[PDB]
Amino acid sequence: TCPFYKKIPGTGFTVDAFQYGVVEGCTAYFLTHFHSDHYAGLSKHFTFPVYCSEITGNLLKNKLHVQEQYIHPLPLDTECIVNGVKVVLLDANHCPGAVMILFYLPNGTVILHTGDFRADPSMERSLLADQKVHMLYLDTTYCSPEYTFPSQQEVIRFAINTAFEAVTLNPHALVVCGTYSIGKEKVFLAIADVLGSKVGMSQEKYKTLQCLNIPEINSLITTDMCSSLVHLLPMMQINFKGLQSHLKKCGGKYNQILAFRPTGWTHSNKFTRIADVIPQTKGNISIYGIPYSEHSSYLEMKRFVQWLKPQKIIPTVNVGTWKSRSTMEKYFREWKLEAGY
């Protein structure tokens, strides 16, 4: 059965609620983004209206085979009427196609559901500037002050410089990047661009990237692995055994691998600056863990919320333990006393 924080009161709507069968009273199911924890349940057999971005719609059609008649893509930044209720979709700064949803309820209440997001000051100049929000359904993934990490731009600078230096010293090195979902495509795109290479990958991953509306994509990716010196592999293969095994397949073209595992936050963020990061190395294989996040840092979250001044906050992440719930409520009250709302 569907939990409370996935329902939008005073509507027939749910958000990211596909794993509970038929939800009583639901006339439209919204999907914020194409990540498995959120789409869990959708398939070719789904017969209710799905509302989402264009990119999420391309993924539902091609990857999950949802029929065309049930996919309802909406443009961003545009007031739309769904089942008699005004909605807006906004860019969430998460993965490709990810949105926040603003709902203008019939009784005058305004609700923002962030989905998964990486808060940014640019959001203070969207359609949110205008107006009051009575309820915030908030992505609280990193809602504690120990969660620190650098800007995506600093992390990409480190990856480009690391890869460019290694391949310039050794023209016979291969670069490998781990993936297990959509998101974080800038990591492998930026490395391939500095090296003058296309990115090589499986047919399944290629299909996924072809759904993403990335400009000039045909110029950037390929299924011909042998033509490419940046390869993508599933994240589970990014270890010394999996990488050794991969090097055997390349027919004596390469004599070194440099590999990247983009992660979220890890405890080494508590101690080591991005500049000072070093790899794990065995023989001719080196593996870098790089902290490329598509969720808000504590400080980014706090700034967004103190700006928005919502009347009530409903967390959507870390809701399963009393200690997590209590900790998050304490921070919401500090923020509110500090800023005065």
Of 116 and 185, which has the nearer Cβ to Ni ion? 116
Of 16, 116, 185, 300, the residue at the interface with Ni ion (CB under 5 A) is 116
Least gap, CB of 94 to Ni ion (angstroms): 6
CA neighbours within 13 Å on the CB side: how many for 252? 0
Select from 3-11, 112-120, 160-168, 322-330 the region that touches Ni ion (CB under 5 A).
112-120
Pairing of strands 135-138, 110-113: parallel
> In Å, how far are 163, 189, 232 from 156, measured between CA atoms?
11, 10, 17
Using the minimum distance from each CB to Ni ion, give the nearer residue, 35 or 205: 35
35 binds Ni ion (CB under 5 A): yes
Residue 113 engages Ni ion in binding (rule: CB under 5 A):
no
User: What are the C-alpha distances in Å from 22 to residues 2, 19, 38, 98?
Assistant: 10, 9, 16, 24
Tell whether residue 303 is a contact of Ni ion (CB under 5 A).
no
What's the closest the beta carbon of residue 181 comes to Ni ion, in angstroms? 8
- In the window 150-209, what residues touch Ni ion (CB under 5 A)? none
The residue count of the chain comes to 341
Residues 6+ apart with CB under 8 A from 99: 32, 33, 52, 53, 56, 76, 89, 90, 91, 92, 115
- Cβ proximity to Ni ion: between 115 and 242 the closer is 115
23-31, 109-117, 124-132, 225-233 -> range binding Ni ion (CB under 5 A): 109-117
C-alpha Rg value of the chain to the nearest Å: 22
- 3-class DSSP assignment, residue 222: strand
Query: Closest CB to Ni ion among 227 and 266?
Result: 266
Pair of tokens at residue 285: 């294989």
What one-character DSSP code corresponds to residue 323? H
Least Å from the CB of residue 141 to Ni ion: 9
Residue 31 or 305: which CB sits closer to Ni ion? Answer: 31
Smallest distance, Å, CB 25 to Ni ion?
26
Only segment of 29-37, 75-83, 207-215, 321-329 that touches Ni ion (CB under 5 A): 29-37
Closer residue to Ni ion in complex, CB, 94/231: 94
CB 316 within 8 A of CB 139: yes
User: Which residues are near Ni ion by CB under 5 A?
Assistant: 35, 116
